[PDB]
A paper describes a structure:
Among the sweet-tasting proteins, [name] is ~100,000 times sweeter than sucrose on a molar basis and about 1,600 times sweeter on a weight basis. The intensely sweet taste of [name] has been widely used not only as a natural sweetener, but also as a flavor enhancer and for masking unpleasant tastes in the food and pharmaceutical industries. Site-directed mutagenesis studies revealed that six lysine residues of Lys19, Lys49, Lys67, Lys106, Lys163, and Lys187, and three arginine residues of Arg76, Arg79, and Arg82 located on the cleft-containing side are responsible for sweetness, and two amino acids residues, Lys67 and Arg82, are particularly important for sweetness. In the present study, three mutant X-ray crystallographic structures of [name] (K78A, K106A, and [name]) were determined at resolutions of 1.07, 1.07 and 1.01 Å, respectively.
The final model of [name] [name] was determined at a slightly higher resolution of 1.01 Å. It consists of 3,309 protein atoms, including hydrogen atoms, 10 tartrate atoms, 18 glycerol atoms and 363 water molecules. Compared to K78A, K106A, and recombinant [name], one tartrate molecule was reduced in [name]. The threshold values of K78A and [name] were 220 and 230 nM, respectively, and sweetness decreased by ~5-fold when compared to recombinant and plant [name]. In Lys137 of recombinant [name], the B-factors of the main-chain and side-chain were 9.33 and 32.24 Å2, respectively. The normalized B-factor ratios of Ala137 were 1.00 for main-chain and 1.18 for side-chain, and those of Lys137 in recombinant [name] for main-chain and side-chain were 0.95 and 2.27, respectively. The normalized B-factor ratio decreased by 1.09 for side-chain, suggesting that the flexibility of the side-chain of Lys137 was substantially reduced. The reduction of flexibility at the interaction sites indeed seems to be consistent with the difference in sweetness, since the threshold value of [name] (230 nM) and K78A (220 nM) is higher than that of K106A (140 nM). The superposition between [name] and recombinant [name] showed no obvious differences in r.m.s.d. values except alternative side-chains and C-terminal Ala207 as with K78A and K106A. Three lysine residues (Lys78, Lys106, and Lys137) are still tightly interacting with the negatively charged residues on the sweet receptor, that is, NZ of Lys78 is 4.5 Å from CG of Asp433_T1R2, NZ of Lys137 is 5.0 Å from CB of Asp215_T1R3, and NZ of Lys106 interact with CG of Asp173_T1R2, suggesting all these tight interactions reflect a good complementarity.
Author numbering: 1 to 207
Write the structure that this text describes.
Amino acid sequence: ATFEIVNRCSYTVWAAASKGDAALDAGGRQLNSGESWTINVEPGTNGGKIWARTDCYFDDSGSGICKTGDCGGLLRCKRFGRPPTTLAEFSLNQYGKDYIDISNIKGFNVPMDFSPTTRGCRGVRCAADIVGQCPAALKAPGGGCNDACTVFQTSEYCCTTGKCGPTEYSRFFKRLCPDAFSYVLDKPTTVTCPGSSNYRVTFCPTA
């Protein structure tokens, strides 16, 4: 499947793509403002994620750091990124269908649209100014808006036991972005697409 990753933000981002135990395609790449990078994701990929990283430095071997979403210091991510990270999440060719969502469960750094480029389903979007509006307690000094699990490490926020409810913090994310997961047991906003759909992830879709 193809995923065109488009940076419409006014700032550079470093796109990342992983399924947690491995890179998807090259795993990461710089996107200056306006650039597009198309990756190929193997059919059947379960639990894939795409995210933006901000404020990165990498040396000539691709080792460094980012202020959000850093994946072990690598340009070419093999693992998931450090919160806060807005997440484009997908599982492809799962009993003949694809499943997509956006999640704020690991916080928010960059606004995103995640849409099919092929027929048969709708896209999802979280494009509100969550960083600007972030509650004081959740503001990340390194940049972004942390989720409450990251900040407070409680069973309720992290939903450790599978017993959790919505919280004042999750409701903030949900108010700003109804169409994204705000906590682990949120009412799902997953979209079912035809198996082997193709996609576009757009950072900063509305500016």
